[PDB]
Each structure stands twice: as C-alpha cells, then as structure tokens.
Amino acid sequence: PISPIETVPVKLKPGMDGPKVKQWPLTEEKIKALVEICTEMEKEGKISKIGPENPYNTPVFAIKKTKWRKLVDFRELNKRTQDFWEVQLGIPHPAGLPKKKSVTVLDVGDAYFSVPLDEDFRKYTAFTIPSINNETPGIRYQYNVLPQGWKGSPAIFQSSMTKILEPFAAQNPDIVIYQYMDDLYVGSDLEIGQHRTKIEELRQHLLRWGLTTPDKKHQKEPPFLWMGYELHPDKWTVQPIVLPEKDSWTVNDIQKLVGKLNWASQIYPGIKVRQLSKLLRGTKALTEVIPLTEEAELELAENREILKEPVHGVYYDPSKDLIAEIQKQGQGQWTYQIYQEPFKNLKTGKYARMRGAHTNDVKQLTEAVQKITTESIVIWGKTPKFKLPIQKETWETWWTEYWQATWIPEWEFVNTPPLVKLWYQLEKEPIVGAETFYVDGAANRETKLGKAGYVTNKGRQKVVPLTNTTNQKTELQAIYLALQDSGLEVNIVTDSQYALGIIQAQPDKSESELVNQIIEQLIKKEKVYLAWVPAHKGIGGNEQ
Amino acid sequence: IETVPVKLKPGMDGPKVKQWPLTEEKIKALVEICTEMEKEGKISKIGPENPYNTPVFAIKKKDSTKWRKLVDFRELNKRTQDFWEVQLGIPHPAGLKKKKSVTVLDVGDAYFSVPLDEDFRKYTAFTIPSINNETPGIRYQYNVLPQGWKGSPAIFQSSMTKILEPFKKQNPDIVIYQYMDDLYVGSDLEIGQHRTKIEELRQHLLRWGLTTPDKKHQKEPPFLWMGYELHPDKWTVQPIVLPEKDSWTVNDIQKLVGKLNWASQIYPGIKVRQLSKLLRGTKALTEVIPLTEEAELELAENREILKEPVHGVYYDPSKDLIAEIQKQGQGQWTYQIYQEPFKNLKTGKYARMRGAHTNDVKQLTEAVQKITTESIVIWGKTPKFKLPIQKETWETWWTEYWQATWIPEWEFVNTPPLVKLWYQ
Ligand SMILES: N#Cc1cc2c(Oc3ccccc3OCCn3ccc(=O)[nH]c3=O)cccn2c1
C-alpha cells in the first residue's frame, strides 16, 4: 500500500500550531491490542516511530467491531488545519446517468492510507501509546499517509485519484468512469469480453499506484444498492420504503415520515406531503406527541395506496429530446413528470407553495416550471420542453398585467383536466350606471372589536358588528359586504391599500376563509371595479 | 516587471462562493476558453489546498457568435476594497455627464499581459462546474491581472495614464474616465467628427499595444447600430405628470388627489384641500363633475410646484446608490436612483422595440445594464438594484442577455404596491 504519488502541501490555520492533547486512558488490553496493529502499520510504512523531538500529540482510543480497530480523536487537529476545497456536496442523480451496456463497481481498500501525506505536515499528526503506569516513556508514532477522520483526507485522496486516473482515460477514452469517494464506477458500450478486459487493465494500473481492488471478478453484481437507490442494468428505483403504522406520532416520527415521502416522490408520482408537514408546523418540541388531522390521515392513506405497487424510472439518452409535463393536485400541490418516451419516466416530482398566504394558479404553475427548470439544468445540463395545462391566451393575459417580470420557455398546450384558468378579472375602468359602494372597516387593538360597512351613492347603508377580528380583516369584510349587497355590476371604493393590494393580485385561493368567500363573490359578478382613495383625508369616506 | 503587493483588509479571508450550475453549452464554452487560456499561461490548475472560489458564467461578447468568459469577482472586490479605492483608487471626474456625446470602449484586454502577485493568485480561483455532479469542476487560478477585478485597472492605472497622455495633449477638451474594463470618452464635438476622433483614440491605443475589440461591422453593417453612444445632457430627474383631461369625473379626481397626496411626501407644499371638498358628497364614480375656481387654483398651483427641482438633494459619497425598476407594461419600464427615500438623484424610463423581439426578462436585464451605465457616467459607481423578479428565475436567465463586463449588486422585491402609474 505504499505510493510514489506527489503530495499536497498543507499548512495549519494562521497563527496556530499543532494539537497537544494528553491521553491517559484506559485498559491494559487496549494498550496491548493497539501495539499489534501499530507494528503492522509501521511495517507497511503507513506510520513511523519517533522520540520527542516534539511530535505534539493526539488522543488515541481503541475500539471493537474479532478484529480490533484504531480510533484517533482528531477534533483538536481538524480545527487547527487549513480549510480545503469542498469535495462533493451532492451525488450524481440516476436520472441523468448515461445508459451503458455494462456497469462495474470497484472499491479501493485502505483508501486514505494508500496516499502519502505532506512531509512538513506529518509531525502535527503524531500521538502516543501510554505505557502501563510506571511512568514509562510512551510509544510515539506519526502518520506518513492520509489519516482517517482528518480534515483533508477526502479532498486529497479524491485529488490524487483524479490525477492518477488521468493517464488512463487518455489511453482508452471510450470508457466512462464516475468517481465517488472511495468508489470508482466504470461503464461502457464495448463487448462484454472487452469491457472485462478494460476493467482488469485499469485494476492493474491502479495496483501500480498502490490502490487495492476486489479480486473476485469485480465485487458487486447488479442490481446495486447505492445511497438509498437501486440500480438495475435497465431501470432505476428507490430502496424499499416502509411507512410505519402507529397510534402515537411524535415530531421525530413525522420528520421521518416527511423525509421518506419526499424521498419516494422522485419516482413514485402523486405523493402529497402538504397536510402531513402541517403537523410539523409546530417547530418547537422534538419529542412531543402530535395528534394527526383528518386530512393528514387521508393524505398518508393515499400515499400508502401509491406505495403499494412498485414503479421505476429509465435512464438518459442525449440523442433524444427532453420533455416535462405538469399536473395540478388542487391543494396548492403540483406533481410533474420528466420523460423521453411517454411510458418511460426519467423522474417525477412535486411542488407546493409555502411562503405567502395568497397565490393564484398561474403563478404557482410558473414557480413549478421554475423549479423544474433549475432541477433540469442541474441534472441533465439542459432545459426541457414543457407540456402545461394552460391556454396561451390565459398566460399571455397573466404576465402582461402582472407587476413582476416572469418568463416561461417554449411550451405546448395540454387539455388534461383540471385546466388552469382566470376565474375572474377586475375591470380596468369604472362601470357607468353601476352602484358605487363606499366601504370602510375599523377595529380596536385591545378589545379586538370593530365593525365593517358601506354607504352607497343611492343612499343605501349597512354596518355589521364584528367580535374577535383585526383592523385588516374588517377592511376585507367591508369589501365582502359590498359584494354581497350589490347587483351584478358594482363599483367599490376602499381606503385600505391592504385589501386593495390583496384583491388586485387576483388570487383564486387562500388560507383565510374570508378571502375564499370574497373570491366566491368575485366569480359570480359580471363586472367588478375597485378604486382607491386616501384614508382620513375626509373625502367620501366612512367614520365609525 | 514583477508585481504590486496585494493584501486584503486585515481581518478578512478570501472569497468562498458556490458555483452556479450551467448549461452543457456554456460548460463547453468555459472548457474550450479556459483550455486555450491555460495554454497562454494566463491561468493554471490548482490543488485541493485552495479552498477559495469565485463564480464564472458564459456570455456573448457583444453581438458575436463566439462566447465570452465572465467572472463574477464581486465578493473579492468587497474584500480588496482597500486596494482599489483607498490606496490605488481611480478618481471619477464629475464633469462627464456635462458633455453631449460619450462613447464607451473595452480596454479589458490590456490586463491579461500583467502578472498578478504570487501570494494573491490563490484568491482568484474559479471552478468550471460539471453536469449532474459527475466530478467536481475544473479548477483554475489567475496568473495575470483578471478581467472584472477592481484591482486590475487600479494596478494598470499608471501604464494607462502613460498611454493616454499623447492623446490628451492633442485635444484637452476631452475627458476620459476608466471604470474597470471600460473606457468612457466624453466630447462636445459634432457626431460626425466625434466618431472619427474616437477612431483616432482607438487606433492610438491599437498601435501602442492595447488591442480593443471595438472593431465594428467593418465597412457595411447589415441592419444594426454601429456605436455604443450615450447622451448625458438629456439625463436629469424627470418631472411628475398630472394627466390632462378636457372634462374631469369623480374617480379621475380621486386618482388625482391620491397621486398628489403621494407627491406630498417629496413636496410639503402640496394642498389637496380644494380638491377634497369637491368630492364631499358621495356620488357615482362615473358622474361627470366640473372643477371650480378654487379647485382650478389648486390645480394650477400644484402643476407649477411639481416641475420645480426638489430642494436640498445632494449626493452622499459615503452612502450606496440604490435603484428601483418597476414594470409599466408594453415594453416600458420606469426607474429611480436614490440614496435616501424620496430624494431622487436620478429618474427615468426605458423602452424597447415593439414587435416580437424582446420579452420581460430581456427588457429588465437590458434596463439594468442601461441604468448601471448611466450611474457609472454620473457618480462613478454602480447602484444596488431592487428587482421586480423572482429570485431563482433571474438567477437563471440573466446571463443570456447580459453583455456587460461588470455585475452590479441586486436583491428581489416581492411587494411593490399601487405605485405603478404614479411614476408613469
Ligand atoms: N454501485 C454502484 C454505482 C454505479 C454507478 C454508476 O455507474 C456508471 C458508471 C459509468 C457510466 C454509467 C453508469 O451508470 C449508469 C446507470 N446504470 C447503472 C447500472 C447498470 O447496470 N447500468 C446502467 O446503465 C454511476 C453513478 C453512480 N453509480 C453507483
């Protein structure tokens, strides 16, 4: 396991030095069982003995898994070493993997120990094996190779591997090698006999650099279990998902449920987490038992009905197009599928609005399209064609009068219900020959009282008393009254930029029941106009 | 020639910024480009011991079919500010907005021959990302003075001042400003001879070793505008307009009164009293109501006070410039640049070609570039924008239409209210 590999120069943090930490503990037999392994690591040249001539120190403990293992507590080193380039924050997603006729998995052994460490560094990594009392001088060792648990080991091993592989993929650039941590994944289109030749060649190449590889053929035979996935030579899916059935549900359980569901939603379509996470809305207690709702139980039941049958996805083929289609589940939840061929889904997903209390369907569709765009760029490096349940004249009307600047790429119509619509439109200009309601509302901050009402141009007046409301809610309530007591054409005038701003956004749904009612009223009307005048300027207003 | 020593502000580390995922197209561009760039000794491949990173994007040069590498050096600029502002900082002349023609050139190809300080080379590290996280990106750091860094023109400033001297001697009515990779040349001349004078300057820089890719359509342009040419004499705070009507109605007067009451924040001398009493009785919106003598008095008064410049509006070099763009629809966008609220240092409106050419995001992007350019011309730096766009959307499509060498700071507002036609 020796290596002639160029080493990465390492420094500690500025104005810092190596760790000095004392270790007494513990047993006679831990001390005894450490020496045996230490000798072998020394013989293999992975470590070397030293007298001080200061080594510094690091705490060292021994653990048992028949075969003992050496554990070093490096927390007092890692804090003192320089920061490194982060390695991989995430893993390759199977949806974007090139399909090859054969795939081989090769794991290297003693990975970090198979790469050398910087010479002017090693002195900081040294430690001691305590003699059995008797104030007897300790056994001081230091690391000549990348230590386990050290801050720079993953990055440096990964780098050394990256450089080592370079004069190979040059010789045979028909073979594709994915690098992940200690693992190397190979795949190709060659003959099954030629592929097995290339793997065997690469193994020897790595062997000359001091990298071990599985001897029996090459280890794991498909399907593979990797990072919670299942990789078949044709199709891919997730690992078995078990949703527990219990009477008591804590926050700890709901976190796992939401986790597993969110996870399983990448392939299994139709999974809805909205109601189940509503229980997780209490963010406070971790161990508190949370009672389920009637909507959440049903949601989980639906998810179970989806998780009965197995379903799986396909792989990526650049020579073919990329298509994505979106469906609305109605609660603010959306599901989407990304495919090449109609019956073969690469992967599925879900998008649900959280932030904000007021949103319409077109905007949510835009945000869904957005998430799909980002995800698509990340995974396949391109953007999909879009199949969306919306008429062009609907969308075109939406983004023209919308204050934000939105965008959607090339997309073709889909008539699959439910379609996204504009259920109503407020009139741009006032209606001539229509009753004009002057609405206002008010509340007391302390008593949470206050009233909502209107005075028309025809002299009609009304006031409804309201208990347990807020200053804003009454400002919505008045505009509600104006919608109830009017004809099919009504001009409303309100002083509240709150309510005005809300209604002008044209929401088709909300959390507040009052707003739901107002939407209901707005759909039934023929023509609706809403104007705005400054409050407390004494113009046409109400004083209550 | 060796190197000018570059130190960050004491108590600050180097830039660590995540790299945005990119299209395979853009990745191929940033691979090819950085490959030949590595072959020219301008950049080198680094190791795992270099934790620093800076974003990188692929844009179009101007109208060109060939790609261009655009580094977002912002976070490095914030941490190098002692170098390019305090110590080596480049002064901004306050008379550039005075001239009637200002042509902008790209001199950024000059910095590529100047070596960067060895100890500081690790900070300029950038990563060319891969697809689906196959591998971590291709790592590179800058051996030469990088484009987009504010320290590059600060260092090159001496050589630049030496080169421009024989030109400034021959015509000392011309003021020249250098902002990073861009050379803003002001003049009072006729358009016809201004463009020629500009060509004189271009060939002057060209014969002294600065090769500027301002070479235009050569002789005959197919359909396009030759130069990038502004006219700051028309840049000033624009007045507020009260819509003129033959006959006024109730609701029209309501919108009027509301608008004026909004204008009462920038103009304490506004009185709506005579317009408030005329709406006293509760009438229909569509009822046609004529104005009185007092009301017309109050209209003619506030029409006069509205076209006067706001008293006591002064630029503060300590404070940042802040820009707001709001969407007016039909390819028109209105914008205001202020430091403190309701004190508007500059206001205006930007519009585009009517037909199927441009869309929302494109219009907004170009608008940002324009406003930024005007701000550079006037106060000598870029405003932080409050953008009327979804964050993740802008973070996606902004590079497509971005032809500028710099990248001003920005943030995204989800609110903006009834202020629509108030600025129209
Ligand atoms: N244990 C495991 C494991 C294998 C892999 C992996 O294998 C590939 C390597 C090169 C090219 C295509 C590949 O796979 C594409 C998908 N695939 C996977 C398995 C198979 O038999 N056939 C197939 O086409 C890539 C990423 C993560 N991995 C994890």
- HEC letters along A452-487: EEEEECCCCEEEEECCCCCHHHHHHHHHHHHHHCCC
Contacts of residue B133 in chain A, CB cutoff 8 Å? 88-93
**Do residue A405 and residue A438 come from a single domain?**
no
Residue matched to tokens 């995540």: B18
CB-facing half-sphere around the CA of A347: CA atoms within 13 A: 23
Say yes or no for a CB contact (<8 Å) between B21 and A500.
Answer: no
Sheet holding A461-465, edge to edge: A461-465, A451-456, A435-441, A489-494, A527-532
Element (H, E) at A253: helix A251-264
Choose the mutation target among B53, B282, B420 for the interface with A, i.e. most A CBs under 10 Å.
B282
> Within this chain, do residues A83 and A178 fall inside the same structural domain, yes or no?
no
The CATH number linked to A381 is: 3.30.70.270
Tell me, what CATH number does B276's domain have? 3.30.70.270
Are A128 and A52 found together in one domain? yes
- Whether the CB-CB separation of A11 and A18 falls below 8 Å is answered with no
Whether residue B195 sits in one domain with residue B183: yes
Range of the domain at B13: 5-94+120-160
Question: Are B10 and B128 found together in one domain?
Answer: yes
Check whether residue A61 and residue A15 sit in a common domain.
yes
For B327, the token pair is 């969407």
- Cα(A103) to ligand 1 centroid in Å equals 5
Which among A85, A374, A407 has CB closest to B50? A85
Q: Of A101, A107, A102, give the one whose Cα is nearest residue A184.
A: A107
- Measured from CB, residues less than 6 Å from any atom of ligand 1 are A 92, 97-100, 103, 105, 176, 178, 185-187, 220, 222, 224, 226, 231, 233, 315
B28 shares its domain with B84:
yes
Is residue A461 less than 8 Å (CB to CB) from chain B? no
Q: Do B23 and A381 touch (CB under 8 A)?
A: yes
Any idea what the Cα angle at residue A60 is, between residues A59 and A63, rounded to 5°?
Answer: 145
Please say whether the beta carbons of B280 and B292 come within 8 A. no
CA pair distance B55, A243, nearest whole angstrom: 42
> What was the resolution (in A) of this experimentally determined structure?
3.5
| A16 and A98, same domain (yes or no) | no
Residue A478 and residue A456 in contact, taking contact as beta carbons nearer than 8 Å: no
Query: Could you tell me which of A461, A541, A446, A447 has the C-alpha nearest to residue A496?
Result: A541
Yes or no, beta carbons of A97 and B132 under 8 Å apart: yes
Nearest atom within ligand 1 for CA of residue A233: 21
d(CA A190, CA A198): 9
| The one-letter amino acid at A422 | L
Domain count, chain A: 5
* Alpha helix segments (H runs only) across B57-190: 74-81, 151-163, 165-170
B49, A380: Cβ pair inside 8 Å?
no
* Residue ranges with strand state E in B89-166: 101-106, 126-128, 138-142
Cα separation, A243 vs A68, in Å, equals 37
Which chain B residues are closer than 8 Å to A498 by Cβ? none
Q: Point out the ligand 1 atom lying closest to the alpha carbon of residue A92.
A: 26
Contact criterion met (CB < 8 Å) for B251 and A537: no
* B56 and B152 fall within a common domain: yes
Choose among B51, B136, B388: nearest Cβ to A83: B51
A522: amino acid identity, one letter: L
Going from the Cα of A538 to the center of ligand 1, the distance in angstroms, rounded, reads 74
d(CA B162, CA B16): 36
The residue contributing the CA closest to ligand 1 atom 1 is: A224
Q: How many domains does chain B have?
A: 4
Residues in chain A, overall count: 544
Q: Judge if A400 and A280 occupy the same domain.
A: no
Cβ neighbours of residue B315 under 8 Å, at least 6 residues apart? B339, B345, B379
Chain A nearest-CA distance from B156, in A, is 31
Q: How far apart are CA B283 and CA B291, in angstroms?
A: 15
Closest listed residue to residue A52, CA positions, set A146, A133, A126, A119: A126
For residues A486 and A537, membership in a common domain is answered with yes
Q: Whose CA is nearest to atom 21 of ligand 1?
A: A233
Question: Of A387, A402, A423, at which residue does a domain stop?
Answer: A423
Separation of CA A312 and ligand 1 centre (Å): 16
Residue in chain A nearest B360 by alpha carbon: A405
Residue A187 Cα to ligand 1 middle (Å) = 7
For residues A199-215, b (16+ Cβ closer than 10 Å) or e, as one string?
beebbeebeebbbbbee
Any idea which residue has 């008593």 for tokens?
A447
> How does A294-325 read in b/e, with b if 16+ C-beta sit within 10 Å?
eebeebbeebeebbeeeeebbbbeeeeebbbb
For residues B154 and B9, state if they share a domain: yes
Partner residues linked to A195 by β-bridges: none
With a CB cutoff of 8 Å and minimum separation 6, the contacts of A93 are A347, A379, B132, B133
The two three-digit tokens of residue A170, written as one number: 């040059």
Residues A55 and A139 in one domain: yes
The H or E element that residue A153 is part of is: helix A153-164
Residue entry with tokens 């021994």? A62
Q: Are residues B27 and B140 in the same domain?
A: yes
* Pair (A413, A428) in one structural domain: no
Identify the domain containing residue A538 by its residue range. 424-544
Tokens of A501: 């701003």
Let me know whether A458 and A515 are in one domain: yes
Which chain B residue has its CA at the smallest distance from A97's CA? B132
B345 and B416, same domain (yes or no): yes
For residue B283, the 8-state DSSP code is: -
Is B257 in the same domain as B332? no
Contact B176, B184 (CB under 8 A): yes
